[PDB]
Design a protein around this ligand. Structure first.
Ligand code: CHL
Ligand code: CHL
Ligand code: CLA
Ligand code: CLA
Ligand code: CLA
Ligand code: CLA
Ligand code: CLA
Ligand code: XAT
Ligand code: XAT
Ligand code: XAT
Ligand code: XAT
Lengths: 229, 212, 41, 205, 207
């Protein structure tokens, strides 16, 4: 089967089973059937938030107004306080999730609509709630299911780019996009740092600490600068 | 088996299966079968405190190259209680309280492996029950990633790595002490000092190790 | 290690080791709490 | 049956019989039936007396302010504590104790041996065949309820009281945290619900 | 069965028979039976005094220091040594001794001969008894407990007695050091937990 490394020899416990299994386990965390099932949800969860997140920042910049994203201040301003939202954020996501988390651990018991009964679906796959969540079904096959991971697993991997780039380069995702294509051999953060024997240069973080928001510290330091190239 | 000091044979009592067993007991302190399992835990514990100690020394040192104002591992004790805000007694006596709990708990699972997770410590059965080996608790808390649950052939292969990385962390952490008492400077400072002018920064030039 | 213990368990050994634990202790009690005539403290 | 946390571990001893058991006992409390039974009436009695109580301290807010109808004052159900009234505390408290103690011993002496006694007073006798320890049929329920909806009904009572109980604890947290009253806080929040919260107004820094 | 520490012993001579038994007797005082019988009563008499007594220390000082309402005369529990008024400490003491020792020898000579402290003719009047061994019952249980919760009730007496004894010793040693009252020792710690701890003052501070 296709693998992450075309000449590789996939680990024993992982063969051709889960959606999109290319045989990648340096550490072999999937050998445990119980925990791998847990991890199986996380990959979707981390993926499905990042995808919707990475598409957020990009749209947040190019079509939208341009402030690379550290912003509390917006042009949707701050309509209802903050502690107003965070109040409603907790109770919202609390119900939303400890609900879905229970369909992971003890499957099917949640399918009923709490108020009245339209239910949902049969028990299906713990991390793929059918029915009301997936009405449209653009592709008709689990080919589309393998098609979902390979997008997300890139986006999660892509998101980390936005952090680090916006650390030292101090610019949004698509700003440095165009900045690279102009004089490409510059701005690789390969050029921009060396650390050979003797000499060590590192670019300094272009975002500062102590960002002022409504009279609050918010230290927000850089991510482990000392070990940067 | 690849023993240390090749050409000899291991001490006849330990040829057995222990992770990282090279047949080194030149003073024969494993000769007591009851006592060996006590040393096997003793090493495992030191190996685990070593590997945390080494990183705890190097990183604040390596952090100091870029600035970021930390102390060296020595005289990091002062700098904290220099700035204090809580007394020394309260801190050291919270140590003995919380820390002594774990150790004196870690002990009675070694004595009798059945208890400690029978129950009736806030529930938590099977998290503390232990996986049956000397220095390996396993479980929910001590093993959050559920590793050492799946393939055992891969597990026994970690248990070897853990020791061999531990024996090196100890033997390095003996260097941090000794090369502090001589050169009086941080571990990464020395790792730069010898990488800069290797010739005049060597051991014979510290003026302590090689007295005249 | 079997037989090294049994020797360390002989009478004169413990007689030495255990008195040297009192002796040392009773010596150092007088280091921190010197000159104790009566129990007054 | 419906539970509080759908798809839960459903304790043994809680198999639904009693009026309103949803299978909620997270502390594995009340395994043995006798202490369970004792608690069953606690929630019953202790729930009823909250309903009337919560309604009790809620009244002074609606009358005194909203309509200001024939003011009784009763500020934040606090000055009701220290108020002129008529009799001294000494007269007044020790008078409720002796009055209530009669009814309390009666109530208890039913449940002590449940199927027996109480019932007939002096002044002849009542004898409405009082059977349920938790609920007594007779003078206590005059309009002649227990009309055949009990299961369908008891639950409605048990479930109201719990929320009257829970809302009560609100007041004691409503009060000591803020210092205003039930409608004082219910109105204050609805002024600017986003800037009026416990997180907002219990943050005094 | 709960153990004092889960991994040790439950000494041979001690099984889990009596309540409040977690298997802790390191110095092995109780070994022979006719002794363990004795100490069990010595515990409860302590456990009972300690519970009542501690509330004599705790609550009065608490009232005063919890507000103006009913300030406790005699101030802290060790400031009530003063404030005798009516009778001299010479007499009031030997009135106690004579008065108590009547009741408590009655308690011992019962443990000696279990059935009846006093059979109906002797010690005119009185002598209701209704006495099981180890617990008086009778008069001393007016509301008529031992309704079938006994075993649990027994566990709840000891386990609270065990703690009030141990907690009482704190009142001694604390006051002997910090010279304050318990809620003073209480709140000052709860105020700032670190600097106000033990072992920052006078005792482990010897270091
Ligand atoms: C257990 C391993 C351990 C090691 C190797 C050290 C190492 C050191 N500590 Mg340290 N500490 C250790 C445990 C702890 N220390 C401290 C808190 C402190 C303080 C406040 C200080 C030290 C100091 C020291 C120095 C020796 C003190 C001395 O009197 O030297 C002579 C023998 C040395 C660098 C002193 C120092 O920084 O000097 C360089 C110092 O002031 N340590 C705590 C919290 C209570 C510990 C918990 O176990
Ligand atoms: C049963 C529920 C009940 C609750 C929760 C309260 C609670 C209260 N009463 Mg109250 N009472 C209650 C029943 C009764 N009270 C009173 C008679 C009084 C008086 C005279 C006063 C209170 C006061 C108070 C306040 C407590 C202040 C205080 O003295 O604390 C400290 C008390 C201790 C630490 C003990 C608070 C509103 C005081 C007040 O009005 O403040 C607003 C007050 O002066 N109550 C009677 C008649 C004997 C009651 C009978 O049920
Ligand atoms: C409690 C929250 C917190 C906060 C506010 C910080 C803040 C900081 N950390 Mg830090 N750190 C934390 C927790 C935190 N850390 C934890 C939990 C760890 C793991 C133990 C680390 C490990 C860590 C490392 C390894 C490094 C930092 C560094 C830094 C600094 C980089 C900021 C910068 O560019 O300015 C520069 C810093 C200043 C201007 C402050 C000087 C006064 C900054 C002061 C870096 C640093 O100091 O070097 C730049 C660095 O190398 N931290
Ligand atoms: C047989 C008679 C006798 C008696 C009654 C004593 C009694 C004493 N001698 Mg002494 N002595 C004796 C014979 C005697 N000695 C002989 C024969 C010699 C010659 C070898 C000496 C030489 C001698 C010297 C040189 C010194 C004493 C000292 C002392 C006093 C200190 C005791 C001590 O260490 O504190 C009590 C110690 C402790 C309580 C430590 C025990 C702690 C444990 C952990 C308690 C645990 C409880 C649970 C003590 C009053 C010392 C002193 O200051 O005298 C003025 C002292 O310096 N003696
Ligand atoms: C949510 C309110 C509520 C409900 C639904 C019930 C329901 C019941 N109670 Mg009950 N009870 C309550 C509150 C309630 N109680 C309170 C607060 C007390 C304390 C005073 C009692 C004291 C009590 C006794 C002593 C007895 C009952 C009995 C009963 C049963 C038959 C009577 C009946 O149908 O009442 C129906 C109740 C309603 C339809 C609610 C009416 C709403 C009122 C009228 C509003 C009045 C406004 C307020 C006073 C201000 C039934 C299970 C009897 C029983 O079970 O005997 C077999 C019985 O003996 N209850
Ligand atoms: C279930 C009935 C109920 C209702 C409708 C309310 C409604 C309200 N409470 Mg409240 N409260 C309740 C129970 C209730 N409470 C209970 C049981 C407690 C004790 C835990 C509190 C403790 C409490 C505090 C300390 C404060 C409020 C406040 C408020 C008001 C602002 C919202 C807020 O901060 O919520 C906070 C409420 C909670 C966090 C508990 C909600 C519990 C569940 C989810 C509700 C169902 C709002 C009118 C605030 C206020 O007065 O602002 C005007 C305020 O300071 N409440
Ligand atoms: C005249 C007064 C008097 C008499 C004769 C006794 C007699 C007794 N008490 Mg006692 N007691 C008394 C007053 C008295 N008490 C007072 C005033 C208190 C304080 C409240 C106590 C508190 C007390 C406790 C806490 C205990 C006793 C115990 C005992 C018994 C064993 C005593 C012992 O070991 O002696 C030893 C000899 C001498 C001390 C001399 C014995 C029957 C013990 C007991 O009954 O154990 C089963 C026990 O645990 N007593
Ligand atoms: C990269 C990543 C994970 C990478 C993990 C890898 C390679 C792991 C590999 C291994 O495990 C395997 C495979 C197998 C093992 O044998 C080996 C190891 C090595 C253990 C997760 C990121 C996951 C990233 C996540 C979950 C991010 C979520 C949140 C987002 C996107 C929210 C963003 C926003 O809130 C902001 C930031 C600001 C707002 O203005 C806008 C919005 C943008 C939308
Ligand atoms: C555990 C350990 C190190 C732990 C380090 C820690 C906790 C870190 C502490 C710090 O971070 C803090 C607390 C504060 C920081 O600011 C500073 C420091 C102080 C640094 C080292 C062990 C170090 C232990 C070492 C080096 C042991 C070497 C032993 C050898 C070689 C023994 C060999 C033999 O025993 C055998 C194998 C067989 C026999 O037959 C023959 C002989 C020879 C007897
Ligand atoms: C009765 C009551 C209040 C009654 C109040 C009255 C009469 C008030 C009267 C007054 O106001 C007026 C009228 C006028 C005022 O001027 C004066 C006073 C006198 C002050 C509150 C009870 C309030 C009762 C409350 C809040 C109880 C909450 C308990 C919970 C949530 C327990 C849950 C669990 O027990 C289960 C369910 C299962 C276990 O496994 C797990 C746990 C968690 C242990
Ligand atoms: C009874 C008691 C205290 C009673 C206090 C009273 C009445 C207080 C009275 C007062 O406050 C008032 C009322 C009012 C104030 O105005 C006057 C005073 C007078 C100040 C303490 C017991 C205190 C008893 C204590 C602390 C016992 C601790 C025992 C421990 C820890 C273990 C013991 C062992 O026996 C085992 C379990 C197993 C063996 O193998 C090992 C060992 C060690 C032998």
């Amino acid at each position: 089967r296709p693998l992450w490394l075309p000449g590789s020899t996939p680990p024993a416990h992982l063969d051709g089973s889960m959606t999109g299994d290319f045989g990648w386990d340096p550490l072999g965390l999937g050998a445990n059937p119980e925990a791998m099932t847990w991890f199986r949800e996380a990959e979707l969860q981390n993926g499905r938030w990042a995808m919707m997140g990475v598409f957020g920042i990009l749209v947040q910049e190019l079509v939208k107004p341009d402030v690379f994203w550290y912003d509390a201040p917006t042009k949707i301003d701050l309509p209802f306080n903050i502690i107003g939202i965070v109040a409603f954020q907790a109770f919202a996501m609390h119900y939303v999730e400890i609900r879905r988390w229970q369909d992971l651990r003890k499957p099917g018991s949640v399918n009923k609509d709490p108020i009245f009964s339209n239910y949902s679906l049969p028990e299906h796959e713990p991390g793929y709630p059918g029915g009301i969540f997936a009405p449209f079904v653009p592709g008709d096959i689990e080919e589309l299911k393998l098609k979902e991971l390979k997008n997300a697993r890139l986006s999660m991997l892509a998101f980390v780019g936005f952090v680090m780039q916006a650390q030292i380069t101090g610019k949004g995702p698509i700003a440095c996009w165009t900045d690279h294509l102009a004089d490409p051999f510059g701005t690789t953060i390969f050029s921009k740092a060396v650390i050979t024997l003797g000499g060590a240069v590192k670019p300094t973080c272009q975002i500062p600490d102590h960002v002022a928001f409504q009279g609050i510290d918010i230290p927000t330091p850089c991510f482990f600068e000392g070990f940067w190239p | 088996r690849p023993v240390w000091y090749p050409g000899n044979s291991p001490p006849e009592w330990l040829d057995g299966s222990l992770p990282g067993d090279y047949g080194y007991d030149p003073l024969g302190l494993a000769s007591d079968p009851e006592m060996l399992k006590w040393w096997v835990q003793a090493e495992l514990v030191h190996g685990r405190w070593a590997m945390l100690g080494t990183v705890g020394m190097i990183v604040p040192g390596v952090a100091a190259r870029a600035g970021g104002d930390f102390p060296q591992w020595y005289d990091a004790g002062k700098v904290y209680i220099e700035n204090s805000s809580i007394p020394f007694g309260a801190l050291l006596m919270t140590q003995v309280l919380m820390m002594g709990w774990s150790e004196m708990m870690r002990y009675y699972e070694f004595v009798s492996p059945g208890s400690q997770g029978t129950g009736s410590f806030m529930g938590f059965t099977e998290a503390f029950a232990g996986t049956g080996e000397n220095g390996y608790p396993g479980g929910r808390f001590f093993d959050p990633f559920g590793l050492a649950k799946g393939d055992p052939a891969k597990l026994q292969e970690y248990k070897v790595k853990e020791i061999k990385n531990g024996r090196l962390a100890m033997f390095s952490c003996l260097g941090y002490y000794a090369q502090y008492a001589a050169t009086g400077k941080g571990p990464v400072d020395n790792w730069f000092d010898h990488i800069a002018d290797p010739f005049h920064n060597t051991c014979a030039t510290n003026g302590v190790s090689v007295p005249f | 290690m079997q037989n090294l213990k049994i020797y360390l368990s002989t009478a004169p050994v413990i007689a030495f080791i255990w008195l040297s634990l009192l002796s040392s202790l009773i010596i150092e009690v007088n280091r921190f709490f010197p000159d104790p005539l009566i129990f007054a403290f | 049956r419906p539970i509080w946390l759908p798809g839960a571990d459903v304790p043994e001893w809680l198999d639904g019989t009693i009026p309103g058991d949803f299978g909620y006992d997270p502390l594995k409390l009340g395994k043995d039936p006798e202490t369970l039974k004792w608690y069953v009436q606690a929630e019953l009695v202790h729930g009823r007396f909250a309903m009337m109580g919560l309604v009790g301290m809620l009244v002074p807010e609606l009358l005194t302010n909203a309509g200001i109808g024939l003011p009784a004052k009763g500020t934040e159900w606090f000055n009701a504590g220290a108020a002129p009234m008529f009799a001294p505390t000494g007269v007044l408290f020790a008078m409720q104790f002796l009055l209530m103690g009669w009814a309390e011993i009666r109530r208890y002496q039913d449940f002590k041996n449940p199927g027996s006694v109480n019932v007939d007073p002096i002044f002849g006798g009542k004898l409405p065949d009082g059977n349920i320890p938790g609920y007594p049929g007779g003078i206590f329920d005059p309009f002649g309820f227990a009309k055949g909806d009990v299961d369908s009904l008891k639950l409605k009572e048990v479930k109201n009281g719990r929320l009257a109980m829970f809302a009560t604890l609100g007041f004691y947290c409503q009060a000591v945290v803020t210092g205003k009253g039930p409608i004082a806080c219910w109105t204050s929040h609805l002024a600017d619900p986003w800037a009026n919260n416990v997180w907002s107004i219990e943050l005094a820094k």
